[PDB]
């Protein structure tokens, strides 16, 4: 009756537009936590190799799968840091296309649907431009001292983000059948 | 063998007087976490709509049930913040009667039984009066900017608190039988 | 060279009244009500707040301003980061928050930090999320309630009103402090 | 107006010796041993503590006091919240903590913040939980152990003894610093 | 499919030399959390009775058992605090022999294998001497105000630590068979 | 006695240039770029950093030093604990970090706190873990990138080079500030 956060937590009734999101990393963290797929526990993947910190809460969507064999990642904008392992309701407001070490790794940019400040945003264009620059720079830089290259491209609108999410929902459901 | 914190964690040998308490919210937090009953995970219910913070650690008693269909809530006084999802041993020292949006929602005021500073308190009357005022004001105010009203009444002695706990223990055991 | 009294010896700045130096007294998230000690220029604990509330933003005063209550003009400064009490920064007014505290007028400026890349581009409080304004209003209405003190907060007024209030404080300081 | 040396230029306050201004040097929870630099009035890092220990409460000194060790009288201030080094607050003595540090006497006041709603009503250290007193004693016994320095802490003495010690420091300051 | 952190999390392929470590206590904490063996949850065992804090992250090795019937404890040196309940990969660099209330209770001193600063240490002798003194003093003192005595002896080299770990791995496997 | 301007009125210390007083402006882990206001001696917010980066260590300046850019000599101080802006500590140089910021030279000292038991025993930057040096270099290369400002950081130079740079700043201060 205790849930594995990727398999057992539901994506939520309003998916793909509104979805449960499991936080892995807190805003301001230098610790890169990640879900351990096997156990469903949080593990330290690494300490970041630069004096950088995550600009926002970061995690993944339960019952999603991508071509890299992991759930779909999400950056969640909100007033407050959230603890790793806790889940929240998020609305997608953009897609951030990236290439990490030659491999495609697009990520959702979302807001917390239960944050009174942020829940009213629907589109990444409504954010201050500096914010977007800060996010882009973070992803370009956070693995630089590991001699890894991350290319970050122009963000794409919510309708693209939501298609990405629906596609990962499909890929997950297709993986669950075989098992 | 991994526990759901409401169903699988025992209430403890000394219940109802002394009980295990699962912390949901840390002292000083603006994040209102709560137990997700289905999964047993911690979720963000909301960010508080006012510039207020929880005055003390806050959570629930495992294997308890109230008329609102949730476990019985507890405010736990102690020297240190405790992380959401962690449990501790608590002694009830009072009952705080409230009405939230017309619905009865009484809460226990407790101390941590393993805090050397606080474990020796047996009654809410032993606390400084200002503390009680601060607690009362918090519950009156924390949902005000959501246009919700919470009436908070005079606190009741430990013997009342312990009856409330025993009653929730009964209501839980009665719910578990049907299933 | 001389170490500065932050009220008297810190300049208000070239862009005033529009953009001005601001001395932080209280950090965002604080339950400690620090204030300028006018005699020494040190920061003092006035009180610990009597409720489980915290300052929603950094808060301080404008140097070389005076109000009828004998104090510099108060400012709430929105920006990404907490700032330490006693440090100063450059701020731009985006509104005025009219209040009455224990029957006395006590208007406060709402501003943004002019050197924060995120917030320096705001010019008007109406550009902020509505919730933000509600949180700020509620704070000032609630923060002295458990001291049985009443604060009424009225609708916020535009930047041109803010700027006029700042200019007036500047004149009252010159009249009462600097020139006699 | 003049910016203040916090030892010399900050007044001890109208209620002294009972209630007095206190300058915080070290914040509750800190492993950094800050101290007043007597020459400049700035705060300096004296050392990082040599053990995994932290100050149990805010700690500082009383302005315009002097002890035989050539320093102001030290004070441990109990209250709800951490206070920043360099800020001052109003405190009430509730006891005296007699100690010997490397063979020299070094009594310290134990006090509460007079403007903290929770703690301002305490008048005597015996009103605190026994554990609190044990933690404080252990801290002072342990905090220099890894520097091979010995501190013996004796049983705490009542407020009337505290107040007498404060009055004496006030007199020694007037004698040695103010009047010559 | 959700893991009990002692039973269900693997010790890791490189054990005993490199092992998964479940953090119980964060660097800087006055809260002594510990694993609840029954549930696999984190619980508050006590608030420390002195004004002391853990000098480093602290936890236990999954699928290990000692003569005191608990998993083997580990102090993990790294740049950053880690949250209770999260696991990480650690390399043993020493054994710290202790006697707690007359009972033998040796503990591993390790580094995080994924911390770029610390992963390159192989031996406790490579640490500044003051660090070792600080650690030793912490264990000698942290239970003093509870009138408990902890004797801490000279640290022993990595090869001893690794034998201790292998032995606890054996004791665990021998306990698992009966069940 | 006089309250001190931290650049002018704080002594560099008896052990200089080897060991020197250092005034912290920015705390380890901070995204706020504080700096000394040379006119007042107060700490001011220069900017909030334009990237999601943080200072890797405590950072400040040496009192009674001058560089061609009209500012005291900058210092990065390694130690166990964050230190508050405006406080001073004793530091030992272990290297020099040569940089060019927007085409202008801007060498900075790398040092350790002389009163931190862990770090006071280091004498040379080569004794630090290689990763530590890479993190520091990357910080200075990256921290102004989103302001479209370029900083090139070159290989670090030994303590004897650091010490010479400090001595030179001391002489330039005496020449330009103290003696005229």
PDB file of C-alpha atoms in Angstrom, chain B residues 30 49-55 130 133-134 137-138 141 144-145, chain C residues 31 50-56 131 134-135 138-139 142 145-146:
ATOM      1  CA  UNK B  30       5.206  28.231   4.534  1.00  0.00           C
ATOM      2  CA  UNK B  49      -1.662  32.418   1.095  1.00  0.00           C
ATOM      3  CA  UNK B  50      -0.315  34.722   3.789  1.00  0.00           C
ATOM      4  CA  UNK B  51       3.169  35.620   5.010  1.00  0.00           C
ATOM      5  CA  UNK B  52       2.771  33.245   7.966  1.00  0.00           C
ATOM      6  CA  UNK B  53       4.735  30.125   8.987  1.00  0.00           C
ATOM      7  CA  UNK B  54       3.847  27.054  11.065  1.00  0.00           C
ATOM      8  CA  UNK B  55       4.813  27.864  14.677  1.00  0.00           C
ATOM      9  CA  UNK B 130       2.162  34.082  24.801  1.00  0.00           C
ATOM     10  CA  UNK B 133      -1.793  33.133  21.852  1.00  0.00           C
ATOM     11  CA  UNK B 134       0.701  32.670  18.973  1.00  0.00           C
ATOM     12  CA  UNK B 137      -3.592  33.284  16.118  1.00  0.00           C
ATOM     13  CA  UNK B 138      -1.798  31.076  13.582  1.00  0.00           C
ATOM     14  CA  UNK B 141      -5.105  33.400  10.300  1.00  0.00           C
ATOM     15  CA  UNK B 144      -7.655  33.997   5.935  1.00  0.00           C
ATOM     16  CA  UNK B 145      -6.303  35.066   2.494  1.00  0.00           C
TER      17      UNK B 145
ATOM     18  CA  UNK C  31      10.384  37.310  12.585  1.00  0.00           C
ATOM     19  CA  UNK C  50       4.049  38.600  18.473  1.00  0.00           C
ATOM     20  CA  UNK C  51       2.561  36.275  15.824  1.00  0.00           C
ATOM     21  CA  UNK C  52       3.844  33.441  13.665  1.00  0.00           C
ATOM     22  CA  UNK C  53       4.314  35.804  10.720  1.00  0.00           C
ATOM     23  CA  UNK C  54       7.397  36.885   8.794  1.00  0.00           C
ATOM     24  CA  UNK C  55       8.339  39.895   6.713  1.00  0.00           C
ATOM     25  CA  UNK C  56       7.260  39.142   3.133  1.00  0.00           C
ATOM     26  CA  UNK C 131      -1.790  37.670  -4.883  1.00  0.00           C
ATOM     27  CA  UNK C 134      -2.843  40.742  -1.039  1.00  0.00           C
ATOM     28  CA  UNK C 135      -0.078  39.004   0.899  1.00  0.00           C
ATOM     29  CA  UNK C 138      -2.440  41.136   4.984  1.00  0.00           C
ATOM     30  CA  UNK C 139       1.029  41.175   6.565  1.00  0.00           C
ATOM     31  CA  UNK C 142      -1.764  41.220  10.906  1.00  0.00           C
ATOM     32  CA  UNK C 145      -2.536  42.093  15.999  1.00  0.00           C
ATOM     33  CA  UNK C 146      -1.224  40.080  18.984  1.00  0.00           C
TER      34      UNK C 146
END
